[PDB]
């Protein structure tokens, strides 16, 4: 259906022990396709998905040039933010930045975003009009004033409505084989007696893509939550995702329970029972 | 494709 391109940046000061650590990663949907790590040997943007490797050296020089501009600007920002918040040069602080754009099934522009954080809290963010800013703090108002006056929103909006969307479409095209795919979950269920009184049914979904999924339990066809549990969706390490949900049941009652699985890769949702 | 314009110091 809908798609996104997103870049994630983290800068971490390590005072005395060198320049800040800087990590950039780019995603299309739930697939990483590029990375930059300041402590890696190449000092270049590097590919992480097959289809981006057909971009030529001009692309790789360009992305490397730009990503360094991101890095060196964050390095300045770390000093600035320390000042804004009257913090010691002792100790480590973090700048994070995320931006990107969403397009629909027909690849039309849906929205854009550009969010910035300091020490893991909202600092400033571009609103949905792609024209104005939400500043979290009194400190962030200074940034908001500067960026207003310097028309940062105008520059970012041009990217988010234009370049971002155009290159996302290019990427979706070039990596159709693997981005425009669904991997339906492989499911199964496991049962572990917690004693003689009760047991645990575990509903598994494995090897699915994209990450979006929903697992729910039912008792006698009615939605059960009170003694459920559901882990955070997790990467398998091969490009697909895993998730499970479990429930504890009095034994000789397992057959009362069904697990329901919904995923883009399934024409119909699955109903699972203990076998 | 990364942003080329609008990365400004805070």
């Amino acid at each position, epitope marked *: 259906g809908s798609h996104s391109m997103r870049y994630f940046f983290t800068s971490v000061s390590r005072p005395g022990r060198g320049e800040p650590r800087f990590i950039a990663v780019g995603y299309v949907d739930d697939t990483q396709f590029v990375r930059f790590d300041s402590d890696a040997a190449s000092q270049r943007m590097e590919p992480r998905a097959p289809w981006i490797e057909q971009e030529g050296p001009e692309y790789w020089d360009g992305e490397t040039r730009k990503v360094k501009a991101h890095s060196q600007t964050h390095r*300045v920002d770390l000093g600035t933010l320390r000042g804004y918040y009257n913090q010691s040069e002792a100790g480590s602080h973090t700048v994070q930045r995320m931006y990107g754009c969403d397009v629909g099934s027909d690849w039309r522009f849906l929205r854009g975003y550009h969010q910035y954080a300091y020490d893991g809290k909202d600092y400033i963010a571009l609103k949905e009009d792609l024209r104005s800013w939400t500043a979290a703090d009194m400190a962030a108002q200074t940034t908001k004033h500067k960026w207003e006056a310097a028309h940062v929103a105008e520059q970012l909006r041009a990217y988010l409505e*234009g370049t971002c969307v155009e290159w996302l479409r290019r990427y979706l095209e070039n990596g159709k084989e693997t981005l425009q795919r669904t991997d339906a979950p492989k499911t199964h269920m496991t049962h572990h007696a917690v004693s003689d009184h009760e047991a645990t049914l575990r509903c598994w979904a494995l090897s699915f893509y994209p990450a979006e999924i929903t697992l729910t339990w039912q008792r006698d066809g009615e939605d059960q939550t009170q003694d459920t549990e559901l882990v955070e969706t997790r990467p398998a390490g091969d490009g697909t995702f895993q998730k499970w949900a479990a429930v504890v049941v009095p034994s000789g009652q397992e057959q009362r329970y069904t697990c329901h699985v919904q995923h883009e890769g399934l024409p119909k949702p699955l109903t699972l029972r203990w076998e | 494709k990364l942003v080329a314009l609008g990365i400004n110091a805070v």
Partner: T-cell receptor
Amino acid sequence: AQTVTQSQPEMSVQEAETVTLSCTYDTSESDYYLFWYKQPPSRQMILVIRQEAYKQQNATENRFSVNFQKAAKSFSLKISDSQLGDAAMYFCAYGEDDKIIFGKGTRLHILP
Amino acid sequence: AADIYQTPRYLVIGTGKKITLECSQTMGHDKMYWYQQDPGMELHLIHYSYGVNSTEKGDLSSESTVSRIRTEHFPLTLESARPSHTSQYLCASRRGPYEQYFGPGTRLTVTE
């Protein structure tokens, strides 16, 4: 290649006539700004025109105007009704967040 | 007008001398740049800066350094002047990716 090309290092124009200074560029990018600077005998770099790549209207400042042709990556500067005070170096230039890159410059003489 | 200042305006020094060219701006601009303009009038980027504590290398500067401990000041130091340092040195400040604002320049001659 991140280059700015001004192929004519010198040009002359009769006073009160119009001249076009040519400039093309190469870049991996679609988001950038373009500029023309004037540097008179004083050697002071002076901004003539700025053009945003995402703006379709051509920048104009009095007698100076640009012909921004993004698909051809061409960025001519037209000087109409040329004045003696127009005599200077003219630099075409390309900008992103990181830096501005300047062409080699064109010396414009005005024949009184 | 433009509030970016370079000193000295003119300088002649002997080969081997360590020299600092001053550049200061009180406009609150975060970014600053140094360009060497050789005879022939090409502008070559030497150093630049995204803000305080940022000192980014440009090209074959033989072998200069900059400091940026405060917004206002971006001094350029030549450690051991050479005759090839004979040039016009142009300092510029900048807001985001917009036009650079150049100071008036320092005209440096390094004599044998």
